[PDB]
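User: My advisor asked me to double-check a structure prediction for ubiquitin carboxyl-terminal hydrolase 15 before group meeting. I don't want to rely on an old file, so could you generate it fresh from this sequence?
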Amino acid sequence: AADLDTQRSDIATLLKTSLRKGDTWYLVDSRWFKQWKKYVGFDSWDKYQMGDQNVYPGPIDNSGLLKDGSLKEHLIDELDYILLPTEGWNKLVSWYTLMEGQEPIARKVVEQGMFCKVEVYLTELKLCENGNMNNVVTRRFSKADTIDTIEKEIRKIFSIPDEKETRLWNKYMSNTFEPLNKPDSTIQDAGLYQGQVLVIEQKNEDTWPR
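Assistant: Sure, here is a fresh prediction for ubiquitin carboxyl-terminal hydrolase 15 from the sequence you gave:
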């Protein structure tokens, strides 16, 4: 691993990296980060345990951010998690390893009015294929993902061949669906929302089923 001063200095700078739309950032549990900061003497006013095995943070552990059994609700930046850009995540992973069984918590930088934010809570969609509206599978997406990305995922889940033509629809109310005709639109631009049903239909061996 880098020496403790290099870790501190690199991460101090990386925490302040400008938020640029479309960059990927990573969540780090503030419990783990607090230990890390003590161990590296991150702050001038807390070098009391710098280098001590007692505050060595061990492998990165984000289990406290994740629902028992998906992120916990009402997490607050700084208080519950900190945010690092790709380079900073990758460095921490290299130095400490990621705890066994965990996956990184990768998120995109989207717009927040005229500013930006890391999109922490993804959008869950209910996906199904027209042959059977009861065989529904849920997947999470960014609001910056495209309609094409959703369609690619549905086609994978339901084993739809690349050659079969399709039409995508979103539920608007009971038995009332609207076409998603623009594969380049983002989820934001299409107006999709949490828990919304999306259905794909394939053309028949001959025409459209729907």
